[PDB]
Amino acid sequence: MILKRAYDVTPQKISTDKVRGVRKRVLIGLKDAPNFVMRLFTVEPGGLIDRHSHPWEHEIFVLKGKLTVLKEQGEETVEEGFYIFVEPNEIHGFRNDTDSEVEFLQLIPK
Amino acid sequence: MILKRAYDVTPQKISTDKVRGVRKRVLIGLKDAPNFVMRLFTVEPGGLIDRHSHPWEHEIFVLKGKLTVLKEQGEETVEEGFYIFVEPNEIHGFRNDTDSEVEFLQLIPK
Ligand SMILES: [Cl-]
Ligand SMILES: [Cl-]
């Protein structure tokens, strides 16, 4: 088995015309698993993932903080302990309006 | 999307000749997702999942507490923030030696 501390993984800052103030850690990656992968995202205060979509589903668990979820229309702010299923091709994004870091686990198929 | 509180899901107590003091919540189940599912397990103080295996892999994230992981040989106690990849057919189990509930997220393929 692989049994490791998530926060020991080196984060990558993500910075594009559509993403700001976000770090990503790959926990269980393509070389480790046969079917789906596990990542941990940290959203800084003011960070933003603009609405977008991919052709695969996402499964998310909110680990820390008040995550604002951008939906195909509108938004909803949720807290640690919420889970999210995002359909294939469903437009969605995220924002952190609070003064502390938000963390969420994200899993996607290979 | 599905956006819901994990702890609002009704738990099921699991009680067999190999499992004691464990509750299970299905968060994203077979009818919701195309490729893999997400469950949340709560291990009571003294709870125990005996060593066993399944022919699919598991991906686990420790949400709360000091989870003791039973390996194919021996054991290791780990804390919130650890992740686990369990290989197909790998013998493994879990125990809670502490005085408070332990929680972990578990995902498996369909
Ligand atoms: Cl970070
Ligand atoms: Cl419970």
Residue range of the domain that includes A2: 1-110
Q: Within an 8 Å CB–CB cutoff, is residue A71 touching chain B?
A: yes
Which two tokens mark B96? Answer: 């809670």
Size of interface A-B (CB pairs under 8 A): 108
Resolution in A: 1.5
- Separation in Å, CA of A82 to nearest CA in chain B: 4
The number of domains in chain A is 1
DSSP one-letter string for A38-106: EEEEEEEEEEEEEEE--SS-EEEEEEES-EEEE-SSSEEEE-TTEEEEE-TT--EEEE--SSS-EEEEE
As a whole number of angstroms, the distance between CA A59 and CA A57 comes to: 7
Elucidation technique: X-ray
Burial letters A38-73, b for 16+ CB under 10 A, else e: bbbbbbeeebbbeeeeeeebbbbbbbebebbbbeee
